[PDB]
Write a protein that binds this ligand. Sequence first.
Ligand SMILES: Nc1ncnc2c1ncn2[C@@H]1O[C@H](COP(=O)(O)OP(=O)(O)OC[C@H]2O[C@@H](O)[C@H](O)[C@@H]2O)[C@@H](O)[C@H]1O
Length: 173
Amino acid sequence: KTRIHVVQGDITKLAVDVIVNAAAPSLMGGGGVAGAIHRAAGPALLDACLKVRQQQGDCPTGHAVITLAGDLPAKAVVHTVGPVWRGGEQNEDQLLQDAYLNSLRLVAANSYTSVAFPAISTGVYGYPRAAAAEIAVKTVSEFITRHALPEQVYFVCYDEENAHLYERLLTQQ
Ligand SMILES: Nc1ncnc2c1ncn2[C@@H]1O[C@H](COP(=O)(O)OP(=O)(O)OC[C@H]2O[C@@H](O)[C@H](O)[C@@H]2O)[C@@H](O)[C@H]1O
């Protein structure tokens, strides 16, 4: 689209309004993007995530929260919790959808115009890469069709295989 883009590389480098984190309910850092993001952002991010936890407890699956972004070139970080993949009969598809939706909603609610997304749930949470990307693209596309904000959406893909996957699902629209 004019509004949705596929970029390949490291999400932490993206100068966008908001960067999206594939988080765990704890919100306390992790391995995949979560680690990359935290490391890049610096200690302020963690302090902020603590404050949130302190205030709302664990972030439930399919939901999302927004914080400052510290040393990141972004203005804010949205932490969202993807589902753990359990074979597809445990409402996973819906919950992944919700993750994308609630994220977008928060970006908008906070008057942000641009947002970057990683491939939520496809790493350690073990979501089949292809089914996931389908939901991501469908959900985001349908949403931006209904809404002025966010104006710009970036799908950040960590490898070429995934990048191509997205790139063509997008043309399937
Ligand atoms: N710097 C990066 N930029 C963009 N994408 C990345 C990066 N590093 C990894 N990825 C990709 O981000 C996607 C997200 O998968 P994960 O980061 O493993 O997160 P997720 O599957 O949603 O499960 C999250 C779980 O792992 C921890 O990282 C996190 O705290 C939580 O416990 C995967 O495609 C992974 O390749």
